[PDB]
Design a protein around this ligand. Structure first.
Ligand SMILES: Cn1cnc2c(O)nc(N)nc21
Ligand SMILES: Cn1cnc2c(O)nc(N)nc21
Ligand SMILES: Cn1cnc2c(O)nc(N)nc21
Ligand SMILES: Cn1cnc2c(O)nc(N)nc21
Lengths: 120, 119, 118, 120
């Protein structure tokens, strides 16, 4: 379907399995993909009929900054839940939470989770 | 299908919901993807069997520069439509309209809208 | 399963407008050939998979050693010769990229991408 | 189907058909994706129902650095293979083994092989 994106959002967060992670913190990135209809929006030009990009960002920030989890799997899952719940026009969404600097000994760009949630 | 592409067209436009995005303006980017058959163009090596990539660029430039809308949706929608209407050789198209510097307090690369259209 | 060569850069003199044919410009090719790789991945054998080096060479040949009006015909003659010389290739996808075309404006690149198979 | 990614792991190894590639060595890069349900991980916040991203790194490194094959097809095959053996919770995977500086006389970014491997 049609799609709103927010590419490579960046937060500082305290999330992790290790208590050393909890204390120090690290970078956390999020990519978002949400699906709806944009034919109406595009034939109209009135934001009242699509989902507001600025609110979708804020939502993401609350989960990554205003709350702490052990797993990036819980960041992704919460984001997805608040999305579908708060926004009834969005059908599907793919959400990817990225830990560019995890505490692993080796050479790499990033580890990440990605889920894709839908209304039953 | 086979695909023609234009990658990362960059414009300056004055689009936006708030009046201040219309005053100041901002960068807008557009990725173009159009679906058609290029087997004929390939074995012929003759441009009339394909679509001119310049005319495509120009067509989008007109939408992003010569007009102004509240919504990127609306930019995506007019491009898809003006491609389909003007080009019958094209079955299907995908247009993505990127705002890289929207006024959101935060840290992000970009926001965007992608639509895929057909007759 | 899949084999890849990414961002092959060549200098060629392709194009519709006769000035492009004297000046020339950059041409990039993304190659993407499909098959099964279970055979080679257990045997550890270049017999049971495709030579990546030859695939580059074939692309080099079509982009550097001949000239066409269209990028679509670079793409075609590559995809046709891949399916000619390599039976075990189920399918292929060629994306030919013109990064510096003579369009007055600001973009990264224009491009064709075909997918061919027997 | 949900996914754990590991992007652009970098190793130095001595893989190659040519005996010269075998003596000198060169860079090798690996991308990993693995499919599994992460909905329970995302509610419980419990790593046991998911899979350690770190152990995944190590699995890949064993193959690239502790062993030496003639082909990159072999590298991705054993990786996929070893993933499927050890982790029942993982349904499928995709492995891209990249060779960024292969001995091809020309101009290019990288050559590579991607495979996808599932269980019965
Ligand atoms: C090892 N490790 C630490 N935190 C983790 C997380 O959120 N997910 C996974 N899969 N592994 C983790
Ligand atoms: C908040 N906001 C402002 N302009 C917008 C647009 O074009 N699309 C969406 N989804 N949100 C917008
Ligand atoms: C305008 N133009 C010049 N060369 C071209 C090509 O190969 N394809 C298309 N579609 N347009 C071209
Ligand atoms: C030509 N060539 C040299 N080494 C190679 C390797 O490891 N794989 C493939 N497919 N080709 C190679």
């Amino acid at each position: 379907m049609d799609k709103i994106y927010i590419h490579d959002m960046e937060f500082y967060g305290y999330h992790g399995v290790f208590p050393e992670e909890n204390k120090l913190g690290q970078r956390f990135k999020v990519d978002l993909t949400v699906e709806l209809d944009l034919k109406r929006a595009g034939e109209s030009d009135d934001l009242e009929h699509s989902v507001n990009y600025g609110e979708l960002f804020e939502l993401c920030r609350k989960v990554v900054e205003d709350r702490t989890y052990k797993l990036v799997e819980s960041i992704a899952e919460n984001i997805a839940t608040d999305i579908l719940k708060q926004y009834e026009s969005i059908s599907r969404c793919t959400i990817k939470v990225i830990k560019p600097d995890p505490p692993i000994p080796g050479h790499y760009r990033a580890v990440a989770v990605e889920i894709t949630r839908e209304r039953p």
